[PDB]
Structure formats: structure tokens, C-alpha cells
Design an enzyme around this catalytic site. Structure first.
Site, PDB file in Angstrom:
ATOM      1  N   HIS A   8       0.850  -1.217   0.000  1.00 56.71           N
ATOM      2  CA  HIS A   8       0.000   0.000   0.000  1.00 56.71           C
ATOM      3  C   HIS A   8       0.877   1.256   0.000  1.00 56.71           C
ATOM      4  O   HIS A   8       0.786   2.099   0.895  1.00 56.71           O
ATOM      5  CB  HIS A   8      -0.940  -0.047   1.174  1.00 56.71           C
ATOM      6  CG  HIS A   8      -2.131  -0.910   0.967  1.00 56.71           C
ATOM      7  ND1 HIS A   8      -2.313  -2.071   1.684  1.00 56.71           N
ATOM      8  CD2 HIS A   8      -3.229  -0.753   0.205  1.00 56.71           C
ATOM      9  CE1 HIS A   8      -3.461  -2.610   1.341  1.00 56.71           C
ATOM     10  NE2 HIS A   8      -4.045  -1.815   0.465  1.00 56.71           N
ATOM     11  N   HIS A  32       1.674   1.298  -5.815  1.00 59.29           N
ATOM     12  CA  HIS A  32       0.232   0.953  -5.886  1.00 59.29           C
ATOM     13  C   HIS A  32      -0.579   2.178  -6.332  1.00 59.29           C
ATOM     14  O   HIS A  32      -1.433   2.003  -7.221  1.00 59.29           O
ATOM     15  CB  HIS A  32      -0.242   0.412  -4.543  1.00 59.29           C
ATOM     16  CG  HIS A  32      -1.713   0.246  -4.440  1.00 59.29           C
ATOM     17  ND1 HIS A  32      -2.403  -0.676  -5.184  1.00 59.29           N
ATOM     18  CD2 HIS A  32      -2.621   0.861  -3.656  1.00 59.29           C
ATOM     19  CE1 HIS A  32      -3.679  -0.608  -4.879  1.00 59.29           C
ATOM     20  NE2 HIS A  32      -3.828   0.316  -3.917  1.00 59.29           N
ATOM     21  N   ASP A  44      -8.452  -0.468  -8.289  1.00 50.51           N
ATOM     22  CA  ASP A  44      -7.771  -0.868  -7.032  1.00 50.51           C
ATOM     23  C   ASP A  44      -7.296  -2.321  -7.078  1.00 50.51           C
ATOM     24  O   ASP A  44      -6.289  -2.677  -6.408  1.00 50.51           O
ATOM     25  CB  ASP A  44      -8.725  -0.674  -5.883  1.00 50.51           C
ATOM     26  CG  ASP A  44      -8.017  -0.445  -4.572  1.00 50.51           C
ATOM     27  OD1 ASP A  44      -6.786  -0.227  -4.561  1.00 50.51           O
ATOM     28  OD2 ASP A  44      -8.703  -0.550  -3.583  1.00 50.51           O
ATOM     29  N   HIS A  79      -5.793   7.665  -3.218  1.00 46.65           N
ATOM     30  CA  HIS A  79      -6.860   6.807  -2.612  1.00 46.65           C
ATOM     31  C   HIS A  79      -6.328   5.973  -1.440  1.00 46.65           C
ATOM     32  O   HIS A  79      -7.147   5.368  -0.697  1.00 46.65           O
ATOM     33  CB  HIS A  79      -7.511   5.893  -3.659  1.00 46.65           C
ATOM     34  CG  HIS A  79      -6.708   4.661  -3.944  1.00 46.65           C
ATOM     35  ND1 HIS A  79      -5.574   4.681  -4.706  1.00 46.65           N
ATOM     36  CD2 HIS A  79      -6.840   3.390  -3.496  1.00 46.65           C
ATOM     37  CE1 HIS A  79      -5.058   3.470  -4.729  1.00 46.65           C
ATOM     38  NE2 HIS A  79      -5.805   2.666  -3.981  1.00 46.65           N
ATOM     39  N   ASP A  80      -5.021   5.830  -1.288  1.00 46.96           N
ATOM     40  CA  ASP A  80      -4.463   5.093  -0.120  1.00 46.96           C
ATOM     41  C   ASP A  80      -3.424   5.944   0.647  1.00 46.96           C
ATOM     42  O   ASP A  80      -2.567   5.346   1.350  1.00 46.96           O
ATOM     43  CB  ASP A  80      -3.894   3.764  -0.589  1.00 46.96           C
ATOM     44  CG  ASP A  80      -4.873   2.601  -0.629  1.00 46.96           C
ATOM     45  OD1 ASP A  80      -5.920   2.588   0.084  1.00 46.96           O
ATOM     46  OD2 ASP A  80      -4.574   1.699  -1.382  1.00 46.96           O
ATOM     47  N   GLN A 119      -7.079 -17.159  -3.297  1.00 49.60           N
ATOM     48  CA  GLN A 119      -7.082 -16.335  -4.544  1.00 49.60           C
ATOM     49  C   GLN A 119      -8.286 -16.744  -5.402  1.00 49.60           C
ATOM     50  O   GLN A 119      -8.986 -15.839  -5.920  1.00 49.60           O
ATOM     51  CB  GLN A 119      -5.760 -16.503  -5.290  1.00 49.60           C
ATOM     52  CG  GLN A 119      -4.558 -15.997  -4.499  1.00 49.60           C
ATOM     53  CD  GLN A 119      -4.485 -14.492  -4.528  1.00 49.60           C
ATOM     54  OE1 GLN A 119      -4.890 -13.852  -5.495  1.00 49.60           O
ATOM     55  NE2 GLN A 119      -4.013 -13.918  -3.435  1.00 49.60           N
TER      56      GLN A 119
HETATM   57  C1  K63 Z   1      -8.707  -8.501  -0.208  1.00 51.47           C
HETATM   58  C2  K63 Z   1      -7.759  -7.786  -1.189  1.00 51.47           C
HETATM   59  O1  K63 Z   1      -6.692  -8.713  -1.502  1.00 51.47           O
HETATM   60  C3  K63 Z   1      -6.271  -8.884  -2.813  1.00 51.47           C
HETATM   61  C4  K63 Z   1      -6.144  -7.835  -3.710  1.00 51.47           C
HETATM   62  C5  K63 Z   1      -5.692  -8.095  -4.980  1.00 51.47           C
HETATM   63  C6  K63 Z   1      -5.423  -9.358  -5.430  1.00 51.47           C
HETATM   64  C7  K63 Z   1      -5.565 -10.400  -4.555  1.00 51.47           C
HETATM   65  C8  K63 Z   1      -5.977 -10.175  -3.265  1.00 51.47           C
HETATM   66  C9  K63 Z   1      -6.158 -11.344  -2.371  1.00 51.47           C
HETATM   67  C10 K63 Z   1      -5.536 -11.428  -1.117  1.00 51.47           C
HETATM   68  C11 K63 Z   1      -5.796 -12.555  -0.339  1.00 51.47           C
HETATM   69  C12 K63 Z   1      -6.675 -13.568  -0.768  1.00 51.47           C
HETATM   70  C13 K63 Z   1      -6.834 -14.693   0.149  1.00 51.47           C
HETATM   71  N1  K63 Z   1      -5.741 -15.384   0.519  1.00 51.47           N
HETATM   72  C14 K63 Z   1      -5.855 -16.400   1.366  1.00 51.47           C
HETATM   73  C15 K63 Z   1      -4.745 -17.148   1.757  1.00 51.47           C
HETATM   74  C16 K63 Z   1      -4.902 -18.155   2.668  1.00 51.47           C
HETATM   75  C17 K63 Z   1      -6.152 -18.451   3.181  1.00 51.47           C
HETATM   76  F1  K63 Z   1      -6.264 -19.468   4.055  1.00 51.47           F
HETATM   77  C18 K63 Z   1      -7.270 -17.777   2.818  1.00 51.47           C
HETATM   78  C19 K63 Z   1      -7.117 -16.747   1.901  1.00 51.47           C
HETATM   79  C20 K63 Z   1      -8.234 -16.035   1.508  1.00 51.47           C
HETATM   80  N2  K63 Z   1      -9.394 -16.371   2.099  1.00 51.47           N
HETATM   81  C21 K63 Z   1     -10.381 -17.000   1.300  1.00 51.47           C
HETATM   82  C22 K63 Z   1     -10.940 -15.839   0.500  1.00 51.47           C
HETATM   83  C23 K63 Z   1     -11.341 -17.302   2.410  1.00 51.47           C
HETATM   84  O2  K63 Z   1     -11.088 -18.080   3.352  1.00 51.47           O
HETATM   85  O3  K63 Z   1     -12.469 -16.574   2.338  1.00 51.47           O
HETATM   86  C24 K63 Z   1      -8.093 -14.976   0.633  1.00 51.47           C
HETATM   87  C25 K63 Z   1      -9.213 -14.214   0.251  1.00 51.47           C
HETATM   88  N3  K63 Z   1     -10.066 -13.558  -0.071  1.00 51.47           N
HETATM   89  C26 K63 Z   1      -7.293 -13.473  -2.013  1.00 51.47           C
HETATM   90  C27 K63 Z   1      -7.036 -12.364  -2.790  1.00 51.47           C
HETATM   91 MG    MG Z   2      -7.294   1.220   0.349  1.00 51.06          MG
HETATM   92 ZN    ZN Z   3      -5.560   0.664  -2.925  1.00 52.27          ZN
END
Ligand code: K63
Ligand code: MG
Ligand code: ZN
Ligand code: CL
Length: 313
Positions: free
Chosen positions: A68, A72, A217, A106-107, A269
Site C-alpha cells: 500500500h 500501488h 484498485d 486513494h491510499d 485467490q
Molecule cells: C482482499 C484484497 O486482496 C487482494 C487484492 C488483490 C489481489 C488479490 C488479493 C487477495 C488477497 C488474499 C486472498 C486470500 N488469501 C488467502 C490465503 C490463505 C487463506 F487461508 C485464505 C485466503 C483467503 N481467504 C479465502 C478468501 C477465504 O477463506 O475466504 C483470501 C481471500 N479472499 C485473495 C485475494
Molecule cells: Mg485502500
Molecule cells: Zn488501494
């Protein structure tokens, strides 16, 4: 003013495409932003001397966190540029001005911690701003930097135009609170499907700008796979440190922020691409057909995440 900013040829061409990566040369990112403002808005929209001074105060006010950060900021502004340049005729002069600045700011002064962690830590910002805590702070930080001497890039706007642009930027920045995304896209989907969507209704424009803001974003998911993957490492660098901090407060973090649940990154992901990213760019493509390359790029990176799980990489 006869001072047209240019880029080297490879950049001059690739900057026009949705999947452009702004590259690792920190000192080229202000030039890239000025290039984008000049092309998107005109050489006339901002006093160069004031815009450069604003940019440099924005830069100074981004912290050196893994994700962040200033890179970004400029990345999210590039995505908005590509939308604004593929849908030139749909947007007001005030919107083209405000949104590029919205994205850059924005951040502002992000700390590498979620709204959740601020509230659980009991940070003074969570007492000043009960919801969209960081997002209200980023907007606050932007106004403060516009109020510095020689920084008001909006100097030439009337009292009207000035309140309009600050209001576009404020709504813009608030919309980056992903907790608000879900409601906004449901509403845009239903309005589009019932044929009730009306870009002459300010309330509707607001929602559409809100979805654009989410789409810019989240644009790491529409990049070349090696960018997507290497950005995700930066994202988990913040999330896991936050999980560490949760644990220090005596709180089990959610798996997404628990470094002990590394093994499940591919699956998380997948859930995100399905729950947020794909629907976001699907709805955006519907409302703004020329943004189709974001949806296709996202689908491609969903498929790379599937390949990770199948151990094909
Ligand atoms: C939120 C913004 O983040 C971003 C931005 C851009 C691209 C990508 C991301 C981004 C960052 C992280 C994740 C993610 N990583 C994990 C790694 C391990 C784990 F156990 C669980 C999760 C996990 N939880 C799943 C969804 C659940 O349990 O609901 C998630 C979620 N959502 C997915 C996308
Ligand atoms: Mg933000
Ligand atoms: Zn952002
Ligand atoms: Cl800090």
C-alpha cells in the site's frame, strides 16, 4: 506549456493497454502520471508547477510498506487512465480531472493494516472514523495536501466546480472500501438487468465510478501472470504481518492473514477471483464494454491460479 511530456517508445505504446506495468524505476512514476493527466485531461487542466509539487507531496505521504505504497497509487491511477481513455466521451471534464487524482491519493498515508486491525488495536483513527476508517483518512490527507501553499491544482475551478470535484474524489476514495463494493455491484447489476441504469442520474454515475474505483484498485489481478504473482507476495507481506499483530493482541487472525495458512493461498485467490474480481470486471464490462480486456485478463489469471493448485506450476 508547449512542453509535451513523452515516454520512450515501448512505454508510449504499452501505457495505452490495460495490463501495462509501470516498472521498477521509482523516479519515472511522476513522469508517467503527468503523461497520463496530459493525455486524459489536457496540458491545460493543471498548472504544471503546482501539479508536480502536489505529486511530490502525495509521494512523500505514502509510506514504505510492502503493497500500500506509491507504486500501488500510480498503478491504480494507470488502470483509471486506461478506462478513461477507452471511454473518452462518457466522462465530464471534472470527472477526468478528479478521478486520476482520486486514484493517486486513494491510499494516502496507509499503514499496511486493515480497517479491522485499527478497530481491534483501538487506533485514534478508528475513534475519529467508525466505518471506512482508512478511506476517510486518505480523503482527509488529500484535502490537507491540496491546502498546502502552491499545491492547489484545482485553483482555477469556480466555487461550484471545486466543491463538485472534491465530492467526486471523496465518493471515489470511499468506494475503495471493499466492504462497500458488494452492495454497490449488486445494485449496479440489478439496475443494468432491469434496464433502469441511467448515466444522467448522479446517484447512478456515483455507483459506476464506485465500480471503476474497485476495478482500478484490484487491477494487480489483470496483469501479466508474473506481475500478478509477484504483487500477491507483497500483498501477503502486509496481510501476514497484520495477522502477527492480531496474535499479539491475543486474537486468531482470519486464514487470509495467518502466515501458518500459506499452503491455502492458491484456493483463497480462487475464492477472491470468484467472489470479487470476476463479478467486478463482469459488471464493469457490461456497463463499459471497452473495459472487456480487464475481465479477460482476470479470467486468464484465475486459470493460472488453478494451474498452481494442480501442481502444473
Ligand atoms: C482482499 C484484497 O486482496 C487482494 C487484492 C488483490 C489481489 C488479490 C488479493 C487477495 C488477497 C488474499 C486472498 C486470500 N488469501 C488467502 C490465503 C490463505 C487463506 F487461508 C485464505 C485466503 C483467503 N481467504 C479465502 C478468501 C477465504 O477463506 O475466504 C483470501 C481471500 N479472499 C485473495 C485475494
Ligand atoms: Mg485502500
Ligand atoms: Zn488501494
Ligand atoms: Cl506505521
Amino acid at each position: 506549456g508547449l512542453m509535451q511530456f513523452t515516454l520512450p517508445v515501448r512505454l508510449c505504446k504499452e501505457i495505452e493497454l490495460f495490463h501495462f506495468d509501470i516498472g521498477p524505476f521509482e523516479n519515472m512514476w511522476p513522469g508517467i502520471f503527468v503523461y497520463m493527466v496530459h493525455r486524459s485531461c489536457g496540458t491545460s487542466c493543471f498548472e504544471l508547477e503546482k501539479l508536480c509539487r502536489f505529486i511530490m507531496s502525495v509521494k512523500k505521504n505514502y509510506r514504505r510498506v510492502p503493497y500500500h505504497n506509491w507504486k500501488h497509487a500510480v498503478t491504480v491511477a494507470h488502470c483509471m487512465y486506461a478506462i478513461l481513455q477507452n471511454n473518452h466521451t462518457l466522462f465530464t471534464d471534472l470527472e477526468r480531472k478528479g478521478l486520476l487524482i482520486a486514484c493517486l491519493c486513494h491510499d494516502l498515508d496507509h499503514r499496511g493494516f486493515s480497517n479491522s486491525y485499527l478497530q481491534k488495536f483501538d487506533h485514534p483513527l478508528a475513534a475519529l472514523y467508525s466505518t471506512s476508517t482508512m478511506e476517510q483518512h486518505h480523503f482527509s490527507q488529500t484535502v490537507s495536501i491540496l491546502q498546502l501553499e502552491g499545491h492547489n491544482i484545482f485553483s482555477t475551478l469556480s466555487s461550484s466546480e471545486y466543491e463538485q470535484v472534491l465530492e467526486i474524489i471523496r465518493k471515489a476514495i470511499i468506494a475503495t472500501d471493499l466492504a462497500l463494493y458488494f452492495g454497490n455491484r449488486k445494485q449496479l447489476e440489478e439496475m443494468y438487468q432491469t434496464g433502469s441504469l441511467n448515466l444522467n442520474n448522479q446517484s447512478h454515475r456515483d455507483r459506476v465510478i464506485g465500480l471503476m474505483m474497485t476495478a482500478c484498485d484490484l487491477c494487480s489481478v489483470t496483469k501479466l501472470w508474473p506481475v500478478t504473482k509477484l504483487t500477491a507476495n507483497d500483498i501477503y507481506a502486509e496481510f501476514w504481518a497484520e495477522g502477527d499483530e492480531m496474535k499479539k493482541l491475543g486474537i486468531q487472525p482470519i486464514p487470509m492473514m495467518d502466515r501458518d495458512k500459506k499452503d491455502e493461498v492458491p484456493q483463497g485467490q480462487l475464492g477472491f477471483y470468484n467472489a470479487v474480481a470476476i463479478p467486478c470486471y463482469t459488471t464493469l464490462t457490461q456497463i463499459l464494454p471497452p473495459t472487456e480486456p480487464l475481465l479477460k485478463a482476470c479470467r486468464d489469471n484465475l486459470s493460472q491460479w488453478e494451474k498452481v493448485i494442480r501442481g502444473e506450476e
